[model samples]
Each structure stands twice: as C-alpha cells, then as structure tokens.
Target chain A: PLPPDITFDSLALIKMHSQNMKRILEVTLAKFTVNLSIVTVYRYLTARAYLKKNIEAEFEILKDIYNIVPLLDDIAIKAAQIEANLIKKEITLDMEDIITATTAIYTNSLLVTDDPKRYEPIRRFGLDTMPLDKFIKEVELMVE
Target chain B: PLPPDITFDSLALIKMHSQNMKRILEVTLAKFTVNLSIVTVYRYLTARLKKNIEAEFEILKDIYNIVPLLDDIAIKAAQIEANLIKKEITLDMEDIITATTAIYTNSLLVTDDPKRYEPIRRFGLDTMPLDKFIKEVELMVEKELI
Candidate 1:
C-alpha cells in the first residue's frame, strides 16, 4: 500500500494498475468477506513505517561490521542472465531464477530450492542445488 | 512428464481420466512442440536424473564448509521480513519469485513462507524498499564495530 501521505492521484501511473494492490484487497475481502476502510489501510501502513526504519538501522550496522560484498553488481548480473538464456532455460518468477541470481554472487555454492523442475536445468548445467533443510545443515557445520 | 517406464495404465485415477490425458498431451505438445516419443521423453528424464546426481555430489563436498551460525544469521532475515511486512515494502522481482522468496527468507532468517504473498507482491511494490537495504548495510557495519 502506498503511504497515507499520497492520494490515489499522487500514486505512480504504474502502481494504479498494479495487480498486487488488487490482489491484496481482493483476497483480504474474499477471505473475510468484510469491507476494509481507509483507516485500516492507514494502520497497516503505519506499522510498515516502523518496521522499515528498524530494519534499515540494522543493515547500516552490519555493513560496517562484516564488510559484506554488496550483492548488486551490474557486470555479474549481466553475465548470469546471458548464461541463463544461452542455454534456453525458460526463466520464470521461480526458485530457479533466485538460485541463478544468488549463484552469480555466491559462486560455487549450491542453491536451495523446493522445486525440482526449476532446478533441473541448473543441475544439467553442472551447477549445484539443494533443499533449504540441506542448506541449514551445511550452515550448522560451518558456524559450529 | 512422467517417465515412460511407468505404464500409463498403472497411473492414479486422476491421470487415468481420458479427457485429462488428452488435455495433458495437447498442452505438452503445444508447449514443447515435440511429437510424443518415449525416446525423447526418456532423454529429458535422463538429463534430469544426471543433473540431480551431480548436484547432490557437489553439495556433499560443501557439507563441512557450511556455517554453524546460519540459524542465528537467519534472525537477520526475519528482522528483514518484519521490516518488509511492517513497511509494506514492495520490491521488484523481474519475474523471479524464488529471488523474492530468498529476499523474504534472508531478511527474516526463517524459511516459513506462510503468507504465500512474496512472489505476487512484487507487482505493486515496484520501488526498492530502501529501508531493508539500508538496514543490511547497517548490520554489516555494526559487525565490524569500528
């Protein structure tokens, strides 16, 4: 939901057509069969504001501590996409794409996804993949 | 597609539905554009089998290198999601739900996707939720304690 400060008119042209906005309200109503007022929307937005601020503060602290590599890199991103398409891997909004993107950053690491169909191609390409449970197990050993 | 070695006659009642079978074949052809052949399906299945075996072998090699505190680091992930849900942050997915799931998981450090809303939310939440990114940066710096 957009901030309460902005009116419907102030929203971006793209957002006005957003499927998410429709879905959120739709599912909320369909499931509850109740009409949500603007006030309810306002409450949700306010809670989000608090959440966002806290998380951002933590991120700044972590950055100074670990010298973590910024995940965003234009060159690496482009290379990953190019490699994905050359192999005719139909990219969808699925775990396959997530693994592909993360693998680009965490090279040589196995992807943990629930979908076998999505990861099959990555494996065929000779990349590693695993379930989330398996990933946690690996992490257990490392941190121990 | 089911492997050819499994006889169609032995499938569950749902798979045995004649119309469903027709629809399945038609849809498969429309999508794959390949004629029905056991050899072709077998080749595809074989490729998948080979890939799974290979990925498992590689994962085994990395077993010892895994992080023990990943469970704790995961708290950072939950904190991130708490922020996202609280802020109603909408990030772009570029049509990648898995990445969105990762964002949700890595942020909150929990794998439970109870909402099932992560993948579809990207559409409305176009702008990057700056707060989450900023928080990640802050945590990274805090760890340095410099």
Candidate 2:
C-alpha cells in the first residue's frame, strides 16, 4: 500500500508508472491506497496525447496504475471552499491544482509529484509534497 | 436537488457558465448537487487557461465531484475510442473519458457539444443540451417532471 491516499499528480503518474519504474509496484509493501486528483488523468492524457507519439503504451500504463473513486458532493464542495480561499489569498494556480490539492489536504495524504513548485502555494494548508524520486526513496525505506 | 448526481462534460463547462447564463445560475444554484466527468477539469483547463479572463476560473466551483477514471472507465473509454477509429470518426481522448465516466457512474451527462460525444452515446450514457438540463432544474423546482 501507499501512505494512505498517496496523491499522484499527473507528472508523477507518468514517471511512477513508466516501463522503467513499474518494478517498484511489485516490491515495497506499504499500507496506503493509490489516488490522484480527478484531474490527474487529464494531465497525463493531455501531456501524451498532445504528442500523438505514445498514446497506446500510455493507455497501457494508465491501466497499469490508477483505480476508481467517485468524487462525491461533499469533497467537491470542500474543494470549492478551498478554491475560494486560495482566490482570496491571492494565490494563483489552476483549478485542477486546487481540486487535486484539496483531495490531498482533505484526506491527509502526501502529494507525490514531479512538479512540486506548482504545489508550493498550497503547502501551508497541510499538503505534504514530494517529487517522484524521493517519494520512491521513502517508499522503499518504509518497508525495506 | 438535482436527481442526485448530474455529471457535466467539460465541453459544456463554457456556455453553462457564460455571463449569458447568469440568469440560469441565480435560479439554479444549490438546487441540487452537480458532477463533472473525470476529464472535465483537464479538458477544460488545458485549452482555456491559455486564454481566459478572471471569471473563467470561477467555473466548477459549483460542481459536485470529478469522477475518477478508474480502470474500467479508462478501459471503456479506450474501447469507445477504438470503435470511433473504425468508423473513421475523429476524436479527442478526453471526450471518451467524459463519456465513459457518465456511463460508469450511472449519471446523465449534460453536454453542449453532443456531436463530439456522438461516438460514445450508444454505450448507455444519456446526454442533453443546456436548455434541457435547465428544464430539468426548472422542473425540479416546479414539479417532478410531471
């Protein structure tokens, strides 16, 4: 398992599930559920589909990881409140960022991402963030 | 107050929130919870953020949830895409996600761009125009679609 709702931003999703990186899935036992902001898939798909270079394998990778979870009304409303606060604070980031970030902070999950800077704006709100390489380092350390 | 989980495709994210629709929102706000396909935000932002005004970000604050693209939904989306390919229909990847999320979530998808959604409609996802959804909202308040 991952560290309880380990939120993989789309950037991390691509790297963590890469052909080169999938070996980790077989090892390193931890107790956590795999998760990402609903927008995570969007980011992954957009980044790759834009290239038209690797759509099929990318789809396979998506299949390799990711699972279903409904975005219920409660969390959605919570995210709306968070976005409004970010707006009031003059914090500028995309809506997907807020939604995904809210998912992490709300669930007390660590956000694993390659793009950490985009998330810096929300760290004060209880988002624990790390890049993929270090995230793996911790994953192995926990169960090795 | 909606029928418990109305999902909106990102393509409709625009006109539904347009200044012209302000009248509708005033009447419809909180009448029911709303949803967006898992692809809603990314599909919306990957294109819009590159060219938007301040208010555009205000969209989806009213949404209910962003259904995750689970393995089954993603697989179904791919299957739908392949079906379109055989028919020579051009498509966007997000469209398939948008369509499959609704089908899998067992929710109605309100989309303005039904043409783009044409390929996946047959897979058991119900969609309607903004006007019809608004009509449902209207009926929600007035009566039970009687």
Candidate 3:
C-alpha cells in the first residue's frame, strides 16, 4: 500500500559491481522503485570511473542509478540541516551517507545500504534503513 | 550562422537569476535554442518557493529545449567526468553533463568558467563566457529585440 521506493548509498551502489550482489540487487531492485543522489553519483560512479576501474564494466548495473536523475531538492536544504544535526552528535558521516538518509526521508523511500553501522541510530528517528541481507530476506518473504 | 543550439552551464543560469540578464537570457535562448540541464534549473529554484517549481518548468518548456538522456552521451560523459576528477578539480556534475551535451549536439557551451572545459577541448568542444556569448547574440539577432 505504501510507496515501494528505495534509496541506496554509495556503499550499496559499490556492491552492484559484484557478481553475486549484482544478481541480488538486480532482482531486488526490479521489485521496487529506486531513487538516487549526486552523492552516490560522485562518490561511486564518477570517482571510481576516474581510476579507469570497473565503472566502465559496471555500466550495465550502474544504469539503474541513472534511471532516476536526481534534482537539487533531492538533497535540499532540509536534508542538509538534518545532516548538520547528525554532525552535532559526532557520528562522523561523509556527504554520501547523509544523502542516502535524507533523500530517503524526504522522498519517503526505504533507505537500503550494505553499510548499516553508520545508519544504526537513524531507525530511532523518522527514517528506516535495513542492511542488504535483511532487506533481501524481508522482500523474500513478500515473494513467497 | 550560429551553432543554432547552445548548452548552458549552471553558472550561466546563475547569471540568469538577475532580472536584467534573465530577460536577456530568455531572449537569447528564444533565438539560439538552448538545452538546459535538468540539474541546472532545479538548482536555480533553490531558496524560491517549491510551489512554483512545477509551474515554472511548464513555462520553461516553451522557451528552452531539454534533450533526452541517452546511453551513449551518458557513457561517454562518464569518461570525461572522470578525467575532470583526476585533475583534482572539484566539480559539480552539471558541468560534465552540459559539456557532454555540447559535444554530442555539436553545440557551444556557454559558461563564465570556460577554463574548466579546456580539458575536453580535444573532443571538439568549444566554450565561451556569458559576456562574449551575449556579444555575438547582440550582433547576429534582431537589433529591435535588444
């Protein structure tokens, strides 16, 4: 009944390059709408491509990230304020993690990440995030 | 005998935020046929009322042409974008996307910061600042419009 939308972090996007994770994400993502941010695009896509690394090879998997072109409001001032508040607690997050968190909150998309330790405190707040494995199994129950 | 289509960087649109240049840009774009970045317009709307975002974009459709995102432009753009990062120059992804559009459409890029685009020059990309671009527009188009 709710919007079956999800936002992935740079870490989660990085995992898309993996053979196993690629297949997993491919099937899982097909089941949901995906949102993206410049944070993920820069940190994972552009930076990785600069290394002459797997970004060229990962283009097929990476196309999904580009599927929803992000706008500035996707990381609007409201999201930046939330990030500043998190910094007040000294949680130490890069801009990438906050983009995933805040965009999910504003867009009302599920925040999915392979890196969950940084997001542990967020569930107590408005945003809900699950690790990759838990999200897979959570959706698995749906399929059954 | 202009390029007919010119792609703008967010910086060029930043110049458009001014009431004077805003009209000039509108007039320039009307004649030149511009391709605006999806990213640029949204950033331009920052600090303004979000309610207008929808209506404004609707109005923009009449003056400017937004190109569809294609796979080849994106893939080739990724390479050029990566090269910018390797130069250790901080970037807004909009510039690279605009740069790629200029290459693909064979349109000239109009920005205040043409130096950033120098790296992509070999790709048959040409860039000019807003002032110089305005000079050409003044010379070529209807003098009565100005």
Candidate 4:
C-alpha cells in the first residue's frame, strides 16, 4: 500500500528490487533535477524476466508496496489505438512502448524511463514522463 | 470519406495498402467470424484518413468506439510471450503481442510471417497465409455464412 495513490514504473521497480539505490543517487547527483514515474502487467512481466530471482518472492514484495494494475480492457484498447496512430504517422514504436505509454495515460500515472527518445512521443499524448535519473532525484528529496 | 460503417484494423490497411487481396480477405473473414482487433496508434491513424488526406479529427471520432482491446487479450499476449520464450522462439515482444491479440480474440491471423506463427497454431491459434485465407473467405461468403 504505497500511500494509496503513489505509483512507479518497471525501471523504478527494477532498481528498488535489486537494491540499486547507490546508482540511483549517483545518477541523480550527476543529473541535477528531480521528478517521479507506474506499474502495469507488462511491467511486472518485464521486471520478472530481468530480475531472474524467485518470481513468487519478487511478486510478493511488489504486491505489498505497489498497486499492480491489471490489464484492463480500456487500457489495452488505448494502447492499440496509440500504436495504430503512430504507425500512420510513419513513427513506428515498439509494442511494449505503446503498452507502457497507454498504461500511464489511462491510469493517470507518471512514466519512468531512462530512455527519453523511445518515450518522448508519448508526451504529445499528454502523459507525464520522467527520465530515471530525474525520478531518482525526486525519490531522494522525498526520503530526506 | 470512409464509409460510416467501415470499421477496420491495422492489418486490413496493411493488406489494402500493399494490394494483397489474400490478406484483405483473411482479415475480413476473421472480422466477420469473430471480431476486429487493433494494436493502437496504427489503427488510430488509419481511421484518420480521408481520400488519402488527413480528415477532420471529428471524422475519425467514432473509430475509437469501434476498435477496442479487451482485458483478457493483453493477458493472453503476456502468456504467449512467456510460452514462446520457454520454447526458445526468437521472436520479439512486438510480434508476440500482435499474434496473441489475434489468437486470444479467436480471430484468424492474416500474416505474411508464417514461420513465426506456425508454432503458435499448436496452442489452438489459427493462422492463414494471405493467399489461402482469401480463398477460405471467398468460400465462406459464397456459402452465405459471411
């Protein structure tokens, strides 16, 4: 129960799960700005794959601290619509990117990512996206 | 102007744009038999066209209501991706989701990538290469089942 409304994305979850806070602090100090990011079913799968630890243990920890948003019908539809629109503009994006963006948009959550280029287009769709380093800075401020 | 009733997906446009009748028919038949499914932005942009020019945004407003991805669809997509990996298939996540969307919706996938999808059929998914799918749709239509 992360304050009932707080949310973070896969990148944040991965960092937290692996206890990579030193890297986060390093990135934040290097970048000099602050911000924050959501978790979806796609993100859960991704985190699991990358973590390669005990799936049940990781899932239990995530469930306690984060709101695991289900892949609702509306969110999926929105994702598909976003993907289709991008294609028509000749801006092909990866499907996972589309899903991740749509999840944030529909859920009204911030999107956390280290790769801005891959996610910058989603800002046009009115999603709040923060780079990982910036997000970590925000987290540091909150802890202090 | 797109016909008021003409609701289609990204695969349909791909088929039409490439002049691939078989693909068109396969997708059409799948829609007729099950229902239409979409990936996202591609479908959105496809609906925005008017005589090859972008139409008023209002013109494409209804398209949103027509194309929707179900809750179960995305779960199925994740499952397919996991399964493919377990089987050591080298397909990317994008292709996995695309195929999963069609399969979970119980619609025939009209794809040119037969090699990638061939293994998927064993999971109770149906796929048709463009040419063969066209013939099947024609047969169904002639039989008055379309």
Give the winner by lDDT.
3
- Where in model 1 is the C-alpha error above 4 Å? A1-53, A64-67, A71-91, A94-106, A112-117, A138-144, B1-91, B94-146
lDDT of 2 by residue, B13-89 (tens): 66666787876666555664465664576445433423442333345543456565565565556556666666788
Best by DockQ: 3
Instruction: Mark the regions of model 2 whose C-alpha exceeds 4 Å error after superposition.
Output: A1-5, A31-69, A89-96, A138-144, B1-75, B78-98, B101-128, B131-146
Tens-place lDDT digits, model 4, residues B16-125: 44544655545453445434443422343434433332342233333333234444554455555566677777766545555666565555665555666776777766
Off by over 4 Å in 4: A1-9, A20-40, A46-92, A102-107, A121-125, B1-9, B16-31, B40-76, B86-88, B143-146
Label model 3 with its docking quality class. Answer: acceptable
lDDT against the true structure, per candidate, is 0.31, 0.64, 0.65, 0.52
TM-score of chain A of each: 0.38, 0.74, 0.72, 0.72
Clashing pairs in 3: none
* Rank by DockQ (best first): 3, 4, 2, 1
Between candidates 1 and 4, the TM-score winner: 4
Query: Each candidate's TM vs. the true structure?
Result: 0.28, 0.53, 0.66, 0.60
Q: Pick by TM-score: which candidate is best?
A: 3
Model 1 per-residue lDDT tens digits across residues A32-81 = 22211121122223333355545345445433432232222321233344
